[PDB]
Design a protein around this ligand. Sequence first.
Ligand code: PCF
Ligand code: PEF
Ligand code: HEM
Ligand code: HEM
Lengths: 57, 431, 76, 110, 110, 126, 126, 62, 48
Amino acid sequence: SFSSLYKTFFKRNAVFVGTIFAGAFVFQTVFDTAITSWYENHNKGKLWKDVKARIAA
Amino acid sequence: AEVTQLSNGIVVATEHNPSAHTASVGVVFGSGAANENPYNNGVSNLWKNIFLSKENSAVAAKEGLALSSNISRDFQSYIVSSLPGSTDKSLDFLNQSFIQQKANLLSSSNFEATKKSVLKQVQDFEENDHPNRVLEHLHSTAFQNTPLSLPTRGTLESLENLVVADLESFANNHFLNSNAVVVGTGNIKHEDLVNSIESKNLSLQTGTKPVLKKKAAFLGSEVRLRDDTLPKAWISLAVEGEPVNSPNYFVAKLAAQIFGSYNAFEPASRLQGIKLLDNIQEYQLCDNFNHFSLSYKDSGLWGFSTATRNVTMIDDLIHFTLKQWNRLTISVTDTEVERAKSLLKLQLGQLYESGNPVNDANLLGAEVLIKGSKLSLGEAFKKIDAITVKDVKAWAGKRLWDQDIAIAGTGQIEGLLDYMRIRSDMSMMRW
Amino acid sequence: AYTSHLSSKTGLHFGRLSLRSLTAYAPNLMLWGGASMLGLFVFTEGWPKFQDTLYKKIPLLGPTLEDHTPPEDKPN
Amino acid sequence: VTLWNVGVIIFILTIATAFLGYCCVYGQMSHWGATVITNLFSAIPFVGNDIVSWLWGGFSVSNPTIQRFFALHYLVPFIIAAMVIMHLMALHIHGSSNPLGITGNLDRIP
Amino acid sequence: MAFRKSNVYLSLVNSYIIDSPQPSSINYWWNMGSLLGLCLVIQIVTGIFMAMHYSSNIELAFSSVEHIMRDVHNGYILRYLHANGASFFFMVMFMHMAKGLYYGSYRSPR
Amino acid sequence: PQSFTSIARIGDYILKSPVLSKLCVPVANQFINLAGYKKLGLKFDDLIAEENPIMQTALRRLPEDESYARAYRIIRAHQTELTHHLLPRNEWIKAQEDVPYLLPYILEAEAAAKEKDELDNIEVSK
Amino acid sequence: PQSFTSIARIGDYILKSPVLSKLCVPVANQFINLAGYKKLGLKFDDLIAEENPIMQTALRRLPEDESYARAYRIIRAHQTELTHHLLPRNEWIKAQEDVPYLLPYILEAEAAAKEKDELDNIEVSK
Amino acid sequence: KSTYRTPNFDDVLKENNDADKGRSYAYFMVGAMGLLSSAGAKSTVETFISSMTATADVLAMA
Amino acid sequence: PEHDERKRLGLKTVIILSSLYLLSIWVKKFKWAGIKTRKFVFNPPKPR
Ligand SMILES: CCCCCCCCCCCCCCCC(=O)OC[C@H](COP(=O)([O-])OCC[N+](C)(C)C)OC(=O)CCCCCCCCCCCCCCC
Ligand SMILES: CCCCCCCCCCCCCCCC(=O)OC[C@H](COP(=O)(O)OCCN)OC(=O)CCCCCCCCCCCCCCC
Ligand code: HEM
Ligand code: HEM
């Protein structure tokens, strides 16, 4: 089942660079939101939204 | 019109062309120069030159015969061409001096003289026959460490340690009766042939040749024997092609005939229907090139073999013909397909029909050994004209787009860029 | 039978190209057009007009681009 | 035609840097010519105001536009110099013409 | 012949960065020149995009540098890339010179 | 830029029809002697641009005497344009010796290259 | 940069004297074995810089077998330093076969060039 | 040693010389490098031309 | 004031660049696998 994968993805270069660009789209967006979610959960209570909810409650 | 009958042992194959003169009876074995190990190599060429020696040829010439032999990479042949009214003489000579006792052929005077002449002509072939030796090095590096890699003539280092024990062991292990096919071309009828093979009892052995452990697998490789003494630069690159009795065989020969063969000094080969000759004719990038398609029993090659006096622009010739190879997959036309169809029909007709009845004997023996019965010239022509452009595009996407190549060079080939550029110029980014 | 001539005729060309070139090239050239539009799709994701017009109308990747800041916490 | 196209590229870059140099002196013709040229450069339908407030660096011709225009007025002549080198290469690989149209390879002068 | 060897600019780019025959046994110390070229292009690019905001008076030099550091978008990135790529430029240059005077490439043909 | 077969076709059709001939060739003769390439001592087929492949083969197929006379006329035109004079009245190319000498070679060379271009774009009936 | 006749006269004065030979030849042997050019499969006469004219004439005057073996040893050194390995213990150049095969040719070439530059600045009796 | 007998490569080779499997593996690796470098090149180009937009004091006094 | 955004973009950039460094080491070893493992054989030629 590797011949079908090679035929539909890496045979012609146009679908190769199109796959690379669409993967760049979805990778950049989910990588950005995942790394900012981790960076804002590693600091809990130190961010401004947490301080604002703390002084609002 | 090409009739085949299986007897008690042997398979008889014949074709009766009643207008030809010299009828030619011989036996074609199915054990060539790829059915041995690399240490007893050249025993097939040594057997051929033992059969063609002075003793045997004087015995055959006193009666009115003329011996022939041809060693290839899976079949080897022993042909006794003769006059048409004299073929029972051919048959009982081939019985009495090759199939039964060979003690007159295999004593240490005739064998010593034959081995010395074979050593001299093999080293003369190695020094002074340059395109055939790089086709041979292409075969030796394409299928390496695997029994199709062997030299046909044999190497010098594995030919000076051969005695009569090697030849007797090879004649016991490969000159069998479930391995042999007797052939008749020229103007012998079929039934007098088998009548004379069944009157006098002719059977070599009974057993079966040893089957090989390793099948022929392509390994994408590279080799260069750069000798800058030589005035030219003989390189040849080739991919894995389709073997014999494969469905994509005639499309491989047609895709070879698409690009054809060329000769830069004849004014009638400079005007062909190739698109490559508008790229390689303004700086004279080569002297000749020929696109072969060899198909052995297990696998085969597909590529071109050139010669270049302009040793600085070697990489441009390689790059231009490889872009022309990628044109097979992406944008091959239909007028190239029909031109190659007619030219392939012409080439196969020039190969199958010719004046010499020993080449027809070799081809008939090979394609009755491997297939079982000979397909005619009509069915081959029908299978040729049943080829559409999309079959060529499918085969070229199967076996030519970004596949591993093997290169073999000699001469002044520093201008040949090294391997990864040539490998990754087999696939372009769609222009 | 016997063919006395060649019953064949020229194609449609402009010297450098022809119709047989563009007929065999056109699926890969429309794929190259799609790949080029995808390339500048990913190259202009930070452009806010294409961001709020097109790059949130994507079904499930949509709410990852916007981040919900209350309006009483920005300087402008 | 390589020489002619590279010359047209130098012509475009020269018009550009002369415009930027005229708009970095900041007189009355300078500022108003800059804002009229970019205000007609905001005629592109989808991205016009976006690219013109990216080019202004603000909301009209002001201090960031003048600093930007001085930096570009340096920078474009040192692209023009490399384009002049390319102009000279594209000339030198074919030789100059002569005011007759006939070939010059017969009688030449160092 | 090929178009990358026929066209005059592409023949230069070909003969310098495509099929320039490099010796077969060079190690990772010979890549410092490519690193120096990349870092020089980095210095020039970040310098232009900082000089679009830097004003060079005596009352505005340090204030304009800390205006780049605080108010322009991603200006901290540009100033730290310039001020640290200069140090990395000189360290890769010291490695280039020390390779050149260790491996004997000051010698008779260069 | 324009093929000489097309120029020859339009010129033959203008020439061998008697209504257009007596209207078109006098203004053509006046345009030629107003152009002034004969005052420098030149035939017309030196003026053609020699940087096409068609013109290069049509020059390499030229005979050995007309090639040397052509090179001399080009060099003499170069020199008398250098000194910003004209050739004297004895050394002007007369109208009867403004014979097209390069034009058969140009026509047959462009016919050969044209036939190659439409032989390799041919299609069999499918 | 240093001519080989100078190195030759210094080395022959060191070797033919008794008190310096057995006190400077062991440290020279240990220096050559510590340099490690033999582990790559190289004699010393491959290590010499070639971009002199003297070394160019001395390499064109080499016999046609030693030139082929020298090219093979240089290419094998290039490859076995490309792999960042060393040659195996059976293919190291032994100390018995580091003979100078190039030094007579370089000595005759530099003697010829020294005689040429000595003859070009000759002074007859004044 | 003959010139047709190749030296051993059986340590640097693989057991299954499949065309599609090895080619797909190599092209997936070069495509992953191209994907990461494409996202990086996009982000650094939009960094460099996001520097040239309106500075925060101009957006404040808008 | 650039502390939070600087360390966040640093995390992004060094993750992307270290993954690119590992993938580029792999593609360098792939492109040089044909050069690290070539073998030279020299038999001495016959004299003329
Ligand atoms: C501008 C100078 C500073 C910037 C300078 C940047 C560095 C110098 C320019 C590098 C640009 C690289 C472009 C590569 C072009 C190309 O041919 O890509 C094809 C590759 C795969 O190609 P392949 O490995 O040969 O395989 C093809 C064989 N098949 C699979 C068809 C069987 O597919 C891929 O490579 C995947 C796509 C990766 C996209 C490239 C990422 C970097 C883009 C930079 C673009 C810069 C150019 C902008 C021009 C306005
Ligand atoms: C490898 C490539 C080399 C060539 C580089 C040039 C090509 C660039 C293509 C476009 C890149 C993305 C643009 C959006 C990013 C952005 O503009 O940012 C988003 C900004 C606002 O940002 P913010 O303040 O909300 O951000 C806060 C957090 N950073 O909106 C704008 O500025 C609107 C104006 C658009 C400016 C770019 C328009 C094109 C300029 C010329 C480019 C040359 C094109 C040449 C084509 C032949
Ligand atoms: C910065 C500006 C320019 C410089 C320094 C420059 C330099 C030169 C030089 C030195 C020559 C050779 C001398 C000559 O042949 O006349 C030349 C020739 C030429 N330039 Fe330019 N040039 C510039 C702009 C242009 C422009 C704008 C064009 C037109 C688009 C152009 C088109 C040409 C042409 C066609 C020639 C060839 C003339 C011939 O040989 O007949 N140049 N240039
Ligand atoms: C040879 C390459 C270059 C080097 C080594 C270099 C080095 C430096 C250094 C060390 C500084 C001081 C940074 C600090 O304050 O610590 C600096 C400042 C500066 N450089 Fe460069 N520079 C180079 C090229 C350029 C170029 C070409 C420009 C203009 C386009 C430029 C623009 C600036 C500016 C505007 C400053 C001001 C202070 C700042 O904002 O950093 N640089 N340079």
